Amino acid sequence: SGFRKMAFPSGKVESCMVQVTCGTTTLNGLWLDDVVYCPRHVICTSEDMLNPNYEDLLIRKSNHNFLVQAGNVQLRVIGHSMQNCVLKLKVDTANPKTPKYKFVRIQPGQTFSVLACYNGSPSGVYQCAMRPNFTIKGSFLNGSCGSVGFNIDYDCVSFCYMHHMELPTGVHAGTDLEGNFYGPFVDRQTAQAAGTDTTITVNVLAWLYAAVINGDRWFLNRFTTTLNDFNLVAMKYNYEPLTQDHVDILGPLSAQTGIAVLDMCASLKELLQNGMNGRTILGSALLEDEFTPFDVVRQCSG
Amino acid sequence: SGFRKMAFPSGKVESCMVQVTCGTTTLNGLWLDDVVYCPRHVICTSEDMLNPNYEDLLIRKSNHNFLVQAGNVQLRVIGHSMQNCVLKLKVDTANPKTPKYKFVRIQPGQTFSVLACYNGSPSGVYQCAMRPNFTIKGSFLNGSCGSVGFNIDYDCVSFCYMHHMELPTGVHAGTDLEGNFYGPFVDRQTAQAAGTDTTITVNVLAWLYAAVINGDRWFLNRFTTTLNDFNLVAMKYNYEPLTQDHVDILGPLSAQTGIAVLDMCASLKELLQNGMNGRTILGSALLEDEFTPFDVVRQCSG
Ligand SMILES: *C(=N)[C@H](C[C@@H]1CCNC1=O)NC(=O)[C@@H]1[C@@H]2[C@H](CN1C(=O)[C@@H](NC(=O)C(F)(F)F)C(C)(C)C)C2(C)C
Ligand SMILES: *C(=N)[C@H](C[C@@H]1CCNC1=O)NC(=O)[C@@H]1[C@@H]2[C@H](CN1C(=O)[C@@H](NC(=O)C(F)(F)F)C(C)(C)C)C2(C)C
């Protein structure tokens, strides 16, 4: 028993983290096969970041302007290209520890582990949910750019995120491994707004199933609701509307506990309408939406 | 910016996890040099665990009764011995990926990362604090025993915990790597009481400094308190008394923010007597005590 926010084991990804330096700017890079991926703003000075012309800035850089280090080994840069907001540096050595991998673009509501790195050295791991407004609540200091987000399915590493910046609100933004930002953000030091956010309804329900599995049942009630009635309440409390596809995704948890999705929706409706009134669920005084149904099943089975 | 509960990168420990089977019972083992460390109840059947005589049970086992698998490779056991609640299996092969390590006994209030494992295979990583009543709030299912807790200091892994059992309150209990239980617990399937817990005062203070560093200041003011007067209030709210040694440990965070320890104590004393009043601190409606002063320094400057 016990339910905790858990990251994937990071060993496979630690073996791909390298340090990338261009002039006086140092950040992290991801070394897969003979290519090192990193944020393109590695070519910027602090002054350039206010209004960069990346195309012109890169034209002034040669392969020798990029120093890539894996541990204490210099990887010779023999080619460079920019794809969206990502810089791809071709190096003279293939990473011998390149795991089986894919580059994926995750959907809002989905989770991933972030291996926070500085100077190409991993310092910590934590889980993030991609908010409906395409931001994440991370922990990133100066030099953390190039740190990656990923999921592991047995032996294959699905890289989904690369860290690029922090918004005025304190939340974080980045790209997929093709260098396309999640959200409307740009890699320029200028105030940018993330949209109004919403609560990930299906994740709240998955977390209530995790709570019941752990013996936290005080919120269970003898009522059942309907999908349409629950959606009237959801809109008022800024919760995403529940769809039949989300009800289907909750199937395995509903089956493991013998608690119907609409029985659990009546618990959620009551929690929203009356408030939690200082009470707790799985140690939390708030309804948590950062766990997917797959995260809950993965943890409740092994 | 940002503050997140973060585990150490797990790669160095993943390379040490093995599967240990004895008869019908399978759990995890930790492979360092030519020794495999695992919980001694691997020699128990379900009925044996009710009231085991471990010495008698171990007499009945030989080296060939222990099946040890590192991935898809069997490691031959050539010696065995029991040290407290841990079984030490000498194997014919030294782990070629043994990191630089040490075995440490952690103090209550300190934190460590847990690499949760099943059948010798890592599944996830999360941070735990050793509660003042010597329990941890983890996530462990059947077969999780033998999973270890650790801290990493640059290249050295300090192993401090090995999982053995779950208590009636849903909390977890285990030993150091020498097999000595943390707390008054025994490796027997019998009802066992964990003592009354207390809040780790120095850790709440460290987290309040992390909140200030991240922009929260509503709880700050010019009021102060003596070390003695704060302790009179702390005792009422089941918080540990704050000592001058704890005040000294908070010194680096106090210097960084320019907020004296007793000034933060006055804010904490105020937060306990007056409540938060609908507000949050670092995305939480409750005061958190699972971050040490070192955990905060690591993220809020490191
Ligand atoms: C990469 N190493 C850092 C990570 C930042 C540092 C503090 N917390 C983080 O997540 N990325 C940057 O410094 C990027 C970089 C220029 C400016 N920058 C920012 O994150 C800035 N934010 C923005 O300009 C904004 F609002 F648009 F997101 C900063 C004010 C420094 C936090 C570029 C090229 C985006
Ligand atoms: C080792 N793989 C498991 C881990 C347990 C399984 C469920 N959650 C866990 O963390 N350890 C055990 O099953 C140990 C083992 C016998 C009984 N046991 C327990 O944890 C039981 N608890 C106790 O009897 C108690 F309360 F005293 F701690 C159980 C009821 C199965 C949760 C031995 C030898 C201690």
Tab-separated table of C-alpha atoms in Angstrom, chain A residues 1-11 14 122-128 137-141 166 172 283 285-286 298-302, chain B residues 1-11 14 115 122-128 137-141 166 172 283 285-286 298-299 301-302:
chain	number	residue	atom	x	y	z
A	1	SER	CA	0.000	0.000	0.000
A	2	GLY	CA	0.817	3.722	-0.185
A	3	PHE	CA	0.443	6.207	-3.032
A	4	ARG	CA	3.265	8.528	-3.910
A	5	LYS	CA	4.184	10.747	-6.879
A	6	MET	CA	6.871	8.701	-8.510
A	7	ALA	CA	9.351	9.300	-11.294
A	8	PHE	CA	10.637	6.684	-13.749
A	9	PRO	CA	14.109	5.256	-12.952
A	10	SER	CA	16.436	7.698	-14.741
A	11	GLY	CA	19.523	5.558	-15.454
A	14	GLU	CA	21.499	9.863	-17.278
A	122	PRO	CA	21.982	14.944	-13.530
A	123	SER	CA	21.009	16.410	-10.149
A	124	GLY	CA	17.446	15.150	-9.533
A	125	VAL	CA	14.252	13.540	-10.909
A	126	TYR	CA	10.566	14.461	-10.495
A	127	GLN	CA	7.222	13.961	-12.200
A	128	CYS	CA	5.342	16.720	-14.106
A	137	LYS	CA	5.226	23.271	-12.527
A	138	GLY	CA	8.877	22.351	-12.357
A	139	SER	CA	12.004	23.274	-10.436
A	140	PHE	CA	14.588	24.783	-12.782
A	141	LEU	CA	17.539	27.047	-11.938
A	166	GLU	CA	10.220	30.031	-17.028
A	172	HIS	CA	7.866	26.413	-17.047
A	283	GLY	CA	-2.399	13.421	2.747
A	285	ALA	CA	-5.970	19.173	1.536
A	286	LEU	CA	-6.644	19.805	-2.222
A	298	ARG	CA	1.062	1.354	-12.977
A	299	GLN	CA	1.561	2.068	-9.273
A	300	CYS	CA	-1.336	-0.118	-8.037
A	301	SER	CA	-0.095	-3.220	-9.976
A	302	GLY	CA	3.728	-2.986	-10.044
B	1	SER	CA	12.580	29.078	-9.693
B	2	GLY	CA	10.024	26.457	-8.498
B	3	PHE	CA	10.155	23.997	-5.613
B	4	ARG	CA	9.495	20.289	-6.137
B	5	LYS	CA	9.901	17.077	-4.143
B	6	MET	CA	12.874	15.587	-5.985
B	7	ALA	CA	14.637	12.224	-5.836
B	8	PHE	CA	18.320	11.565	-6.621
B	9	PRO	CA	19.060	10.223	-10.114
B	10	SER	CA	18.737	6.422	-9.680
B	11	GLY	CA	21.114	5.026	-12.346
B	14	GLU	CA	19.554	0.490	-10.722
B	115	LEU	CA	14.137	3.044	-5.793
B	122	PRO	CA	13.346	-0.937	-10.951
B	123	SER	CA	9.888	0.594	-11.331
B	124	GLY	CA	10.057	4.090	-9.846
B	125	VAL	CA	11.838	6.549	-7.616
B	126	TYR	CA	10.556	8.835	-4.864
B	127	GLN	CA	11.752	10.771	-1.836
B	128	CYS	CA	10.924	9.798	1.778
B	137	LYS	CA	5.297	7.108	3.952
B	138	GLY	CA	6.155	5.119	0.828
B	139	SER	CA	4.506	3.121	-1.882
B	140	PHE	CA	5.338	-0.574	-1.618
B	141	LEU	CA	3.339	-3.505	-2.975
B	166	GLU	CA	4.095	-2.305	6.110
B	172	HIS	CA	6.424	1.439	6.036
B	283	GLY	CA	0.969	24.939	-3.893
B	285	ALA	CA	-2.784	24.104	1.989
B	286	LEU	CA	-0.818	22.318	4.786
B	298	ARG	CA	20.078	21.928	-3.156
B	299	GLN	CA	17.121	23.462	-5.105
B	301	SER	CA	20.668	27.940	-4.832
B	302	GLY	CA	22.397	24.679	-5.835
